[PDB]
């Protein structure tokens, strides 16, 4: 009402030479916009709240292993790799033979069980830790990689162990530029060189994560490798607190909008400005 009376005062000249349908056209548009924005608001609040629900359910019960799980992947049943060979768990190759049961023979000889190629959780990590130790023992054997692996901190080692699991130690050794700079402990120039390679162009996702791990010597790109980093999404509930703003001023915002649609159409730039100022005060 104050805006109507103010509008007519500060704009229209003359003693009652006009009607008040701005008021009504203005009450109705407000009913429209408060409803629309309010519904859309509640829809959002429901969505983050049932989302938050599935996250509270997502916490149930309760490291290089999570690393190698992430880019390579964990399988509890036998499958085939990119080259189609026989593999189980994390990158553990039973046989390169096209034979279907040649893998089952090797696995059963490895884990010491009669399984058809279906394995339990712990055995996945056992075969992994085993594959790793073996890869580490081999690096120390290799005279091109050994000084580097000795140089690096545990985290960056885990990165080198990762490159070995993909490319094979013989493959990691051809990196002599990148490896030299890695032992010289200049991590940026090392990362810039690692970026240039057939290894990058082929799998520049994994290669990108390994590289920023070499850089930062940190697990973040990839000790946060625990699914507990998912627990961190829990603190992104802050949206719930942001609403309390958006909605508190929702009504006010819709008033301006209703009035702006209705009264302002025929007004100068300067007119809308000052009228809006009156409206806000």
């Amino acid at each position: 009402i104050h805006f109507d009376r103010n509008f007519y005062q500060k704009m229209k000249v003359g003693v009652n030479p006009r009607s008040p349908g701005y008021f009504i056209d203005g009450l109705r548009a407000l009913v429209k916009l408060v409803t629309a924005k309010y519904q859309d608001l509640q829809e959002n609040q429901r969505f983050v709240n049932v989302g938050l629900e599935k996250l509270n359910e997502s916490v149930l019960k309760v490291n290089i292993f999570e690393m190698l799980r992430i880019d390579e992947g964990l399988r509890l049943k036998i499958y085939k790799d990119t080259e189609g060979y026989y593999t189980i768990g994390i990158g553990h190759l039973l046989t390169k033979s096209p034979s279907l049961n040649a893998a089952k023979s090797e696995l059963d000889k490895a884990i010491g069980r009669n399984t058809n190629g279906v394995i339990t959780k712990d055995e996945a990590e056992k075969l992994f830790n085993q594959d790793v130790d073996a890869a580490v023992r081999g690096i120390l054997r290799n005279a091109k990689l050994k000084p580097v692996y000795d140089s690096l901190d545990a985290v960056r080692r885990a990165a080198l162990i990762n490159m070995v699991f993909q490319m094979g130690e013989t493959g990691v050794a051809g990196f002599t530029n990148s490896l030299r700079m890695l032992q010289q402990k200049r991590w940026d120039e090392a990362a810039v060189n690692l970026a240039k390679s057939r290894w990058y162009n082929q799998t520049p996702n994994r290669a990108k994560r390994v590289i920023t791990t070499f850089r930062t010597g940190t697990w973040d790109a990839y000790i946060s490798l625990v699914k507990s980093l998912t627990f961190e999404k829990e603190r992104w509930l802050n949206t719930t607190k942001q609403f309390s703003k958006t909605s508190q001023e929702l009504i006010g915002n819709c008033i301006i909008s209703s009035i702006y649609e209705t009264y302002f159409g025929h007004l100068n730039e300067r007119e809308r400005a000052d009228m809006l100022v009156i409206l806000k005060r």
Binding site: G51, K54, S58, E66, R69, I70, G73, L74, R75, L76, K121, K227, L229, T230, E232, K233, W236
Partner: protein, 141 residues
């Protein structure tokens, strides 16, 4: 709305494939890297979201600092309009005026202002006969 639809998009991928089957022993981790990627896109969001609160007052201030250029140009224009009302050849549109003002570019605000007068004179002096050049000089001055 693009970034919040990108977040909602991965927030959708999270909900979708978190319920999928049950155990999720392996793959949901292969999704978690996509939600780890979600965390980076969520930092992109907070980066834009934080530089919004910085934008508004810097903007709101810049309209005040440039006020003067506007208020001079409304009177300089008004003058040219009045030349046009005396004789048919002397018309001008806000188009030509703005087009002239663009040339000003291609104590800062002072300079941009001083240039305004000098460029408006320099151009439109030519569309007027000697009498009005002299009226125009004295008025604008």
């Amino acid at each position: 709305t693009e970034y919040k639809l990108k977040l909602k998009n991965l927030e959708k991928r999270l909900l979708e494939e978190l319920n999928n089957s049950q155990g999720n022993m392996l793959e949901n981790d292969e999704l978690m890297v996509t939600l780890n990627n979600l965390k980076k896109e969520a930092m992109n969001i907070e980066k834009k979201l934080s530089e919004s609160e910085e934008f508004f007052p810097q903007f709101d201030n810049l309209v005040e600092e440039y006020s003067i250029i506007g208020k001079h140009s409304v009177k300089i224009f008004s003058m040219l309009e009045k030349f046009g009302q005396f004789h048919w050849f002397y018309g001008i549109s806000i188009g030509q005026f703005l087009s002239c003002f663009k040339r000003v570019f291609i104590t800062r605000v002072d300079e941009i202002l001083w240039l305004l007068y000098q460029e408006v004179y320099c151009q439109f002096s030519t569309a007027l006969d000697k009498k009005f050049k002299m009226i125009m000089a004295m008025t604008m001055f």
